[PDB]
Each structure stands twice: as C-alpha cells, then as structure tokens.
Amino acid sequence: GVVVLPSGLQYKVINSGNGVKPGKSDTVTVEYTGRLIDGTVFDSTEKTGKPATFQVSQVIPGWTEALQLMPAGSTWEIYVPSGLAYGPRSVGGPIGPNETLIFKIHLISVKKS
Amino acid sequence: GVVVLPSGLQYKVINSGNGVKPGKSDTVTVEYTGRLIDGTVFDSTEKTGKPATFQVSQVIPGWTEALQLMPAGSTWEIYVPSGLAYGPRSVGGPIGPNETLIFKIHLISVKKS
Numbered sequence: 001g002v003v004v005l006p007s008g009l010q011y012k013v014i015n016s017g018n019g020v021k022p023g024k025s026d027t028v029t030v031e032y033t034g035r036l037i038d039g040t041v042f043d044s045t046e047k048t049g050k051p052a053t054f055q056v057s058q059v060i061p062g063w064t065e066a067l068q069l070m071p072a073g074s075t076w077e078i079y080v081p082s083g084l085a086y087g088p089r090s091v092g093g094p095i096g097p098n099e100t101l102i103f104k105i106h107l108i109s110v111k112k113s
Numbered sequence: 114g115v116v117v118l119p120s121g122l123q124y125k126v127i128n129s130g131n132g133v134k135p136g137k138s139d140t141v142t143v144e145y146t147g148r149l150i151d152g153t154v155f156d157s158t159e160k161t162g163k164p165a166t167f168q169v170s171q172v173i174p175g176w177t178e179a180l181q182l183m184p185a186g187s188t189w190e191i192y193v194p195s196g197l198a199y200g201p202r203s204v205g206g207p208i209g210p211n212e213t214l215i216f217k218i219h220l221i222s223v224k225k226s
Binding site: 040041042052053054089092093094095 | 140155156160165166168170171204205207
C-alpha cells in the first residue's frame with residue numbers, strides 16, 4: 001500500500017480522515033514520530049506530551065507535499081527522500097548527510113490564515 | 114549587560130527595537146542562530162536562507178519567555194539553561210543531555226490572534 005508521488009515522496013495511509021486538506025498558508029495541528037531506517041526515533045510529540053502547531057510552509061518539503069494531500073483527521077506514514085528533508089547537510093542530531101526519514105504523521109486539525 | 118531573570122534565562126540586548134511584544138498565542142517571524150557553549154552551531158535561519166515563523170507557545174520555554182519581552186525589531190542574545198530548553202532529555206544528537214544553549218534572535222515581525 002505504499003504510494004509513490006512524482007517528487008519521490010512515498011506514503012502509506014494508515015487511516016483516512018474526512019476533514020479539509022491544508023494549503024501552505026494554513027496552520028496545522030499534528031502529532032508525529034520521526035525515525036531513521038535503523039529505527040532510531042529523532043523527535044516525537046510523545047516526548048513533549050503535546051501536539052505540535054506550525055504553518056504548513058515552515059516544515060521540510062516532504063511534509064509540505066504530504067500535508068497538502070492529507071484530510072484533517074488522517075494518519076499517514078511518509079518515507080521522505082533526503083532531498084525532500086535535510087539533504088546533504090547533517091542537522092544537529094543522528095540525522096547525518098543524505099538521510100532518509102520516516103514519519104508517522106497524525107493530522108489533527110487545520111486552521112486557515 | 115547580561116540581565117538575569119527569575120527563571121534562569123539570561124539575555125543581552127544587542128539592538129533594541131520599537132515594536133510590539135508578542136503574546137503567548139501570537140505568531141512571530143525571526144532570524145536566529147543557535148549554538149552550544151563550545152561554539153558548535155546546531156541550527157540557523159541562514160542555513161535555510163529564509164526567516165522562520167512560529168507560534169510563541171510552540172517553541173522551547175526559554176524562547177517563549179524571551180520573545181514576549183522582545184520588542185519587534187530587537188536583537189537579543191539569550192542564554193537558555195537546559196531546564197528552559199530541552200533539559201535532561203537530550204536530542205539524541207549534538208545537543209546532548211542538560212545542555213545550555215545560546216541563541217542570537219532577531220525579532221522581525223509579530224502576528225496577532
């Protein structure tokens with residue numbers, strides 16, 4: 001059930017929602033877990049206790065591509081090529097150069113701006 | 114000089130602004146560079162080339178407090194104790210456990226609601 005998008009982003013719908021899909025100016029409330037292919041979790045909303053709220057445009061391109069397709073309420077797993085994430089740069093963490101990232105994202109709510 | 118707050122947060126005004134101070138619900142656009150006490154830069158708005166926009170409530174507690182005291186236009190340097198940052202939890206990478214963080218923050222714009 002892994003769909004491949006033209007960008008190379010891949011995703012698996014765990015559960016589909018019925019709410020609206022965000023655009024890039026929208027503000028989004030989500031819960032997520034990010035992992036490397038070895039399984040190391042790099043950040044999570046479970047670690048913080050609370051959901052995360054941000055503008056769809058301020059996240060890495062792999063997320064901005066997925067979010068615009070996710071109806072509110074949905075839970076997807078996306079598999080982000082390094083070019084749609086942090087690229088050849090190593091980003092303060094076990095995330096090194098040209099790192100593939102796996103995110104299980106749960107889109108809670110969409111707010112327009 | 115370096116002002117000390119009851120929380121343990123410290124800040125130094127590099128340049129003062131005239132603008133409004135954001136509230137806890139407000140959205141903020143900034144330019145920043147974050148580093149450790151050895152001087153390792155872990156993230157910067159220059160590495161992206163574009164400013165960052167956030168909700169004041171969605172950032173680490175040292176920033177949430179500092180931003181609400183910063184007039185828009187101000188440039189501060191804040192010195193965040195681990196307690197007001199990522200604490201004893203470690204980010205699984207460079208930051209590491211109970212790390213003090215230094216941020217050069219440039220408050221550009223403040224958004225309401």
